Amino acid sequence: MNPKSLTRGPRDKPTPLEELLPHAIEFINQYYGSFKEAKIEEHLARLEAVTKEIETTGTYQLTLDELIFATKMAWRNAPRCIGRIQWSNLQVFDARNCSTAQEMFQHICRHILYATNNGNIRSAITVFPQRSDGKHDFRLWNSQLIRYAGYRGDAATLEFTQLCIDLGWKPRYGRFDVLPLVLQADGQDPEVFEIPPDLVLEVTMLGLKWYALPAVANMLLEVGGLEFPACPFNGWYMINVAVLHSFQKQNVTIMDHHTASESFMKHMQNVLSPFYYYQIEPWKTHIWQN
Amino acid sequence: MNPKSLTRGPRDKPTPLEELLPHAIEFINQYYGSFKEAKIEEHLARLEAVTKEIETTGTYQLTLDELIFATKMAWRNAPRCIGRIQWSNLQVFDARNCSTAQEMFQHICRHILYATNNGNIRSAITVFPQRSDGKHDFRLWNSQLIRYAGYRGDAATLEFTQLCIDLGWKPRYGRFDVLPLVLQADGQDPEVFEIPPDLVLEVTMLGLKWYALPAVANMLLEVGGLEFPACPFNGWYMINVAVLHSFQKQNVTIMDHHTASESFMKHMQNVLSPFYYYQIEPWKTHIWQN
Numbered sequence: 001m002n003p004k005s006l007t008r009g010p011r012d013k014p015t016p017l018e019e020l021l022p023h024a025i026e027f028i029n030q031y032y033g034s035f036k037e038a039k040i041e042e043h044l045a046r047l048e049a050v051t052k053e054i055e056t057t058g059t060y061q062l063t064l065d066e067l068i069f070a071t072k073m074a075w076r077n078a079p080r081c082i083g084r085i086q087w088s089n090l091q092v093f094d095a096r097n098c099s100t101a102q103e104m105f106q107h108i109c110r111h112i113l114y115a116t117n118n119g120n121i122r123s124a125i126t127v128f129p130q131r132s133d134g135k136h137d138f139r140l141w142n143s144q145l146i147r148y149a150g151y152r153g154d155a156a157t158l159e160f161t162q163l164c165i166d167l168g169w170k171p172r173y174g175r176f177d178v179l180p181l182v183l184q185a186d187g188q189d190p191e192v193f194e195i196p197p198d199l200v201l202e203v204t205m206l207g208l209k210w211y212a213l214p215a216v217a218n219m220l221l222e223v224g225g226l227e228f229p230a231c232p233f234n235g236w237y238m239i240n241v242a243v244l245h246s247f248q249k250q251n252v253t254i255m256d257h258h259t260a261s262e263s264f265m266k267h268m269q270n271v272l273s274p275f276y277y278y279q280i281e282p283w284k285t286h287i288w289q290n
Numbered sequence: 291m292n293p294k295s296l297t298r299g300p301r302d303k304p305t306p307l308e309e310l311l312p313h314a315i316e317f318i319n320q321y322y323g324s325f326k327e328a329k330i331e332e333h334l335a336r337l338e339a340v341t342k343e344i345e346t347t348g349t350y351q352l353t354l355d356e357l358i359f360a361t362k363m364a365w366r367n368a369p370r371c372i373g374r375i376q377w378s379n380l381q382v383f384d385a386r387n388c389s390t391a392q393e394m395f396q397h398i399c400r401h402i403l404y405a406t407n408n409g410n411i412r413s414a415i416t417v418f419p420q421r422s423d424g425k426h427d428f429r430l431w432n433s434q435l436i437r438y439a440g441y442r443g444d445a446a447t448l449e450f451t452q453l454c455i456d457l458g459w460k461p462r463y464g465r466f467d468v469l470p471l472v473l474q475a476d477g478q479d480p481e482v483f484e485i486p487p488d489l490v491l492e493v494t495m496l497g498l499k500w501y502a503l504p505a506v507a508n509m510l511l512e513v514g515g516l517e518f519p520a521c522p523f524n525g526w527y528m529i530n531v532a533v534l535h536s537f538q539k540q541n542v543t544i545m546d547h548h549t550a551s552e553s554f555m556k557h558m559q560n561v562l563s564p565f566y567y568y569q570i571e572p573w574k575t576h577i578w579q580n
């Protein structure tokens with residue numbers, strides 16, 4: 001067998017132009033190929049402009065339409081995602097001009113707001129600035145945007161919870177404490193941000209509940225040789241029947257037969273690359289500056 | 291003399307509870323003893339919970355903190371390891387929930403990535419699921435993660451190379467062919483996985499070169515009576531001066547005076563058991579199912 005690694009790690013230098021160029025060209029082909037017989041002269045003009053940009057600046061910028069296409073094809077290329085059958089239903093938020101952690105925070109609040117939509121969940125992705133030299137990465141240290149702390153609590157976040165504590169987050173001691181956002185901008189040490197409680201929608205099932213929005217915070221989007229290490233996205237959720245009942249009763253989207261049908265109906269009315277990679281946990285690789 | 295065996299062999303049955311219990315208790319003591327005067331009541335609570343677990347399930351699970359402590363103490367207890375002077379500099383990857391060979395492969399890719407770090411080598415260990423009845427062992431059949439094939443090539447891998455061939459691996463015939471990973475999961479027949487070439491960093495010294503990452507693939511970690519037969523780890527390397535020059539020139543970590551000092555400085559800023567045992571080569575003991 002010759003499987004590929006599903007993980008894409010850090011760099012300390014910009015991608016060499018001899019590597020970047022061929023990948024960019026191949027992506028540009030995939031993009032314009034989605035027009036088949038149309039736009040041959042536009043295709044050629046874009047190839048020429050991308051090359052000059054790479055040769056003069058060392059890298060290049062995608063157009064908004066190219067980025068939207070990229071996020072949807074990478075979703076389509078996601079092997080285990082059951083949601084990818086309706087890949088055209090995706091809202092993109094372009095945050096490639098973001099510069100600070102405070103700004104990252106505001107972008108994520110907007111994402112959570114739009115995607116939760118009072119319970120009528122919508123799929124979205126927010127794209128932060130692409131990697132440059134690898135020393136100025138944007139990263140979300142959380143694995144999901146919304147997740148409970150573990151001390152009592154979620155057993156699988158003991159490590160990250162302790163980390164938030166080490167960073168000056170005050171630990172409550174319930175079993176449903178929503179962890180803070182831990183946000184790295186421009187390669188700096190991360191900063192801790194409480195999520196405004198009113199942004200977190202929960203479904204009550206004894207005192208049992210769970211958050212409504214499943215959003216992956218920690219993967220990397222690759223496209224045409226460019227890498228975006230910060231690109232949170234969300235879908236909706238897929239002895240056990242209590243939950244299926246509680247979400248429907250409370251009008252929160254899950255992937256039941258009705259939803260599978262309607263979301264597919266909406267879709268129809270509309271080495272793999274591009275691709276979403278896993279990353280190495282940033283607290284294992286980060287060099288602290290203070 | 292009464293030396294102990296440095297080898298720990300296979301089982302066909304779970305460890306008897308009368309043997310496991312005392313060993314678990316002694317390890318729990320060693321762990322909480324590293325707090326001296328603190329945590330007497332936590333110590334007692336953990337003893338009680340471990341016993342009930344063993345008495346009801348036949349075995350027990352370490353906490354993440356206990357596993358990290360165990361891997362570092364076993365390194366400290368390694369008689370011939372020169373690296374053990376800085377035993378606190380060790381990154382642990384917890385893979386105890388791994389179930390398939392494809393999954394083992396992805397864990398090892400991640401390990402190789404993190405540890406190589408573009409040449410700035412970091413020590414790491416990846417821990418796979420502990421032994422249960424001895425019939426479902428996880429094992430790496432390689433002796434090191436990275437090693438060259440021998441036909442022409444490395445003279446000391448003729449046997450393993452032939453084995454890879456017998457298993458359907460296509461033999462090149464250079465003298466620097468990187469062997470495939472041969473991975474056993476859940477006691478099944480091993481599967482063969484090519485290592486992605488870009489994951490293998492080499493130092494060029496005539497056409498002479500060598501791989502940068504020395505990683506032992508085939509030992510067993512023992513702790514509190516539990517056995518982990520799959521736990522690859524790595525450090526860095528220790529008429530001959532050509533190599534010492536080439537690694538430094540190419541910015542790949544070796545154990546020279548500068549590195550000895552800095553790694554020790556970082557450490558200070560931070561029957562033996564636990565212990566790493568040797569094993570019997572698995573192709574000598576494995577019963578094939580197909």
Ligand code: HEM
Nearest residue numbers: 075078079080081082083123233234235236237238255276
């Ligand atoms: C609309 C709702 C969606 C549903 C119901 C859905 C469902 C799933 C499920 C069930 C998994 C497997 C997780 C597991 O192993 O437990 C998965 C994985 C994943 N999903 Fe989604 N998803 C949705 C939306 C999205 C979106 C919007 C994206 C990205 C734009 C996406 C990207 C991925 C990726 C990259 C993985 C991992 C794939 C892999 O490792 O093979 N999903 N999804």
Ligand code: HEM
Nearest residue numbers: 365368369370371372373413523524525526527528545566
């Ligand atoms: C940081 C770099 C490290 C260096 C420079 C280093 C160096 C060495 C050397 C020179 C040997 C003797 C090999 C021989 O006989 O040729 C050795 C053996 C060994 N090392 Fe390391 N090591 C390092 C990291 C590690 C790590 C991370 C572990 C485990 C967590 C480890 C565990 C062992 C074990 C179990 C042996 C065999 C000990 C014995 O049989 O007496 N080493 N190491």
Ligand SMILES: Cc1cc(Oc2ccc3c(c2)OCO3)nc(Oc2ccc(-n3ccnc3)cc2)n1
Nearest residue numbers: 081083144156214215216233234235236237238
């Ligand atoms: C232990 C655990 C349990 C769950 O619960 C699920 C299970 C299945 C599923 C979920 C969450 O969202 C889409 O389909 N999620 C996670 O983390 C995830 C994984 C994937 C995920 N996702 C969103 C869109 N695509 C994948 C969200 C949250 N961890």
Ligand SMILES: Cc1cc(Oc2ccc3c(c2)OCO3)nc(Oc2ccc(-n3ccnc3)cc2)n1
Nearest residue numbers: 371373434446504505506523524525526527528
């Ligand atoms: C014939 C041969 C030659 C070498 O070369 C060395 C020698 C010394 C050394 C090495 C590799 O890594 C740490 O110190 N390694 C091996 O296999 C090993 C042994 C130990 C080893 N190791 C890594 C960490 N601790 C021990 C890695 C690879 N075999």
